[model samples]
Target: MASHHHHHHLDQQPAAQRTYAKAILEVCTCKFRAYPQIQAFIQSGRPAKFPNLQIKYVRGLDPVVKLLDASGKVQETLSITKWNTDTVEEFFETHLAKDGAGKNSYSVVEDADGDDDEDYLRTNRI
Candidate 1:
């Protein structure tokens, strides 16, 4: 009989050799479970479409997103500054959902070089 142990094999590989993923931002319409929806989007491999996308949590009047656990508890409030591969999975597992319209509204701004016009860069909300 052969024993199946993938964990042991992964340990043999160098940490650097392992592939790393990116963290994504999740939004919701209202105060509902949104992490699942966000995770699906990221897993679909469309994160590249959003360049300025960032993760944040509603804290007091400001938005922060530094919490690790995905319990969806309001008590865990913190601002997120940096994200890496390991944390990427958590981003999807903990965040992402479809609560309501405009609940996950995000903005993007484009800069036009050598243009001094007020509309040189266009801003769009998604």
Candidate 2:
């Protein structure tokens, strides 16, 4: 009697969708549809979390995000088509450098002090 189609997790549902003339006409509801997802993503505090990020919005576009580097080069592209807000936040937390001081990049210490240990700082440690 477990014919109920409702599911909880975003990647939970695995539906048997209908076929169409175009193979691209199929949508796996598990995480493909993004109607309410975008509404919450934009309205939530996610945008303000990274003031330096440049987010763009356009029509006829799928739910995709492109990761860009400081040199205007494309690093990678992510499709959050099925990710919930919580999942999205988790992805950002792991990948996005909101503080700009990520270990992957060079950063200036905000509270740098006097050069009392210049020799030690400039020492070449193998």
Candidate 3:
């Protein structure tokens, strides 16, 4: 008899988590359509040029967007739990800008335990 093992990190995550992560990544990638370079950067798995944004998945938490500077130092962290097109679009609109200076703040709406509010997991601009 032979023993088999699977070591894929994503495969180790729950099915629901994996699905949410994929959906969030797709939404984030779509936001870079206007900027081809940044789009390429994201597709190539690199950080953006200005503001230096990167999307990553964390266990027990929603997808997070980390804001970095020219030196590649993290300046802010945005936690996003809702995995939807509207929420993703609002994320970029509230936290990032074309010239990287207009919007600088946002609020993440946390969903309650077993709560099914239609507007519960939305993002709010500050």
Candidates 1 and 2 compared by lDDT, better number:
2
12 in model 2: Cα distance from truth in Å? 40
For each candidate, give its TM-score against the true structure: 0.19, 0.42, 0.26
Candidate 1 per-residue lDDT, tens place, 7-96, comes to: 564445545423222232433323324234434544565443433233533342222333332334442334332233335534434343
Which consecutive 10 residues in model 2 have the weakest lDDT in total? 18-27
Model 1 has an lDDT value of 0.38
Pick the TM-score winner.
2
- Return the candidate ranking by TM-score, descending: 2, 3, 1
Give per-candidate clash totals. 7, 1, 0
- For model 3, residues 1-126, the per-residue Cα lDDT tens digits are 134556544335443322211112222443343434433544553233323233443343434455544465555444433333344444543454344433335545465587544755557788
Best by lDDT: 2
Model 3, which residues run further than 4 Å from truth? Answer: 1-62, 82-85, 100-126
**Model 2 residue 21 CA deviation in Å:** 42
TM-score of 3: 0.26
lDDT of each: 0.38, 0.45, 0.40
**65 Cα displacement, candidate 1 (Å):** 2.2
- The residue-by-residue lDDT of candidate 2 on 1-126, one tens digit each, is 255546545453424431111001112233334466554555575754653444555435665555555565555556666544446544444455455433344455445676533343556789
